[PDB]
Amino acid sequence: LDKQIKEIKEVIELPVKHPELFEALGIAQPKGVLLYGPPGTGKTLLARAVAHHTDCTFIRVSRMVRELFVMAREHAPSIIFMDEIDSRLEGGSGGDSEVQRTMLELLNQLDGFEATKNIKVIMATNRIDILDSALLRPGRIDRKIEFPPPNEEARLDILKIHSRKMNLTRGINLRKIAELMPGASGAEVKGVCTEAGMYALRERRVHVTQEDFEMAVAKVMQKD
């Protein structure tokens, strides 16, 4: 995910080294960013990893939708990410329109007036509310970063990060085993590893070979 972190450095890595001179920087920093696509890798590992490099608090959403907004009002400097909401008018669109009003007043506070510096959040949307939320957000003040499925170059490094945590043989080729993991997104590789450790357990071996990873490839390709 080198392209995703390279494109997110300006979004999350920007308030890291210079949190105080935002009043001096008059380049109109964007208020939030959205990442649409299969939430394989980038919903928790990216936000908690780059936010773990920021060394700041990480508040999550996880009617009961207003007390967390008051807590977000108290602890304003943080990284808030939508995780539970990412799943004709009617009463259900009025109750949902209460949260639409919550994000409209998040654009009225964030875009209204900067109370405290370092207010940067990340959106998450993958359903019809892409055309509805995008119908209500005509790209006026919003960072548009496209979230593509992880390519092969995004599979070698996510395979390394998701391979260092467990055992690995010294005679495996990451090129072919990375090119032989198709499907939805980067969570499929996590399906190969997490669904391969059970075969390493069943086989009763100290390490994992490339043939076991190929078996997990066949498993995830039969589950897709």
Partner: protein, 237 residues
């Protein structure tokens, strides 16, 4: 079948018979197993089979075990069970019917249920803190998935969601064989209309229905049970 017995088998009993392997076999928290399906009886023969395949302690606590006037008895009971579990032996906690104790609430008329669901949040964070070397298993079974709290269904906590099919053909064959194996074997007794009819009219406790059929076949005028007390036992209960 064998899907549920295999998934609970290798996902449940294989990690149970291994100590401190969690951070060496590809660390994951598949500690929560959730079952579903109102029409299937369940929760009895699976718990018996677990209690026979393994020889350890078992904490059978139906969800309504802490519904009392004392709101503070909850954390004392589940905390004593937690400490005796982590200290004595890796037991298995059977939490049943989470629908009545896993429902959202906004008003304060039912403040007892909100207080015990805040206890459920307390142990919901304790299980997050107990991710390192916890000596207990937490299985779960529910019959309603509409009003469940989103915190339980969040990944990492309940990573096992098994389902029950409406036709329990293999469970009917095993539940009739397990009762006819001890009872007198009649060559007239058929199992095809009694494996095809419960496909339409499905129900629970079929073994208890066979026991009631034996209680109707204890008249001593009929030496072995037959279809009369089978279909009669069906139409009665």
């Amino acid at each position: 079948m064998d899907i549920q017995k295999q998934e609970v088998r290798e996902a449940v009993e294989l990690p149970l018979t291994h100590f401190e392997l969690y951070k060496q076999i590809g660390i994951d928290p598949p500690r929560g197993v959730l079952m579903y399906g109102p029409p299937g009886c369940g929760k009895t023969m699976l718990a018996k089979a677990v209690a026979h395949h393994t020889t350890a302690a078992f904490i059978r606590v139906v969800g309504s075990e802490f519904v009392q006037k004392y709101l503070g008895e909850g954390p004392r009971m589940v905390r004593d069970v937690f400490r005796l579990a982590k200290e004595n032996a890796p037991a298995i906690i059977f939490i049943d019917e989470i629908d009545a104790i896993a429902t959202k609430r906004f008003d304060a008329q039912t403040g007892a249920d909100r207080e015990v669901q805040r206890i459920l949040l307390e142990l919901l964070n304790q299980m997050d803190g107990f991710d390192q070397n916890v000596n207990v298993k937490v299985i779960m079974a529910t019959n309603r998935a509409d009003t469940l709290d989103p915190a339980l269904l969040r990944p990492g906590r309940l990573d096992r969601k098994i389902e029950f099919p409406l036709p329990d053909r293999r469970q009917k064959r095993l539940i009739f064989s397990t009762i006819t194996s001890k009872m007198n074997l009649s060559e007239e007794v058929d199992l095809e209309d009694y494996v095809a009819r419960p496909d339409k009219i499905s129900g629970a406790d079929i073994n208890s229905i066979c026991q009631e059929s034996g209680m109707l076949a204890v008249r001593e005028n009929r030496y072995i049970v037959l279809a009369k007390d089978f279909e009669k036992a069906y139409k009665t209960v």
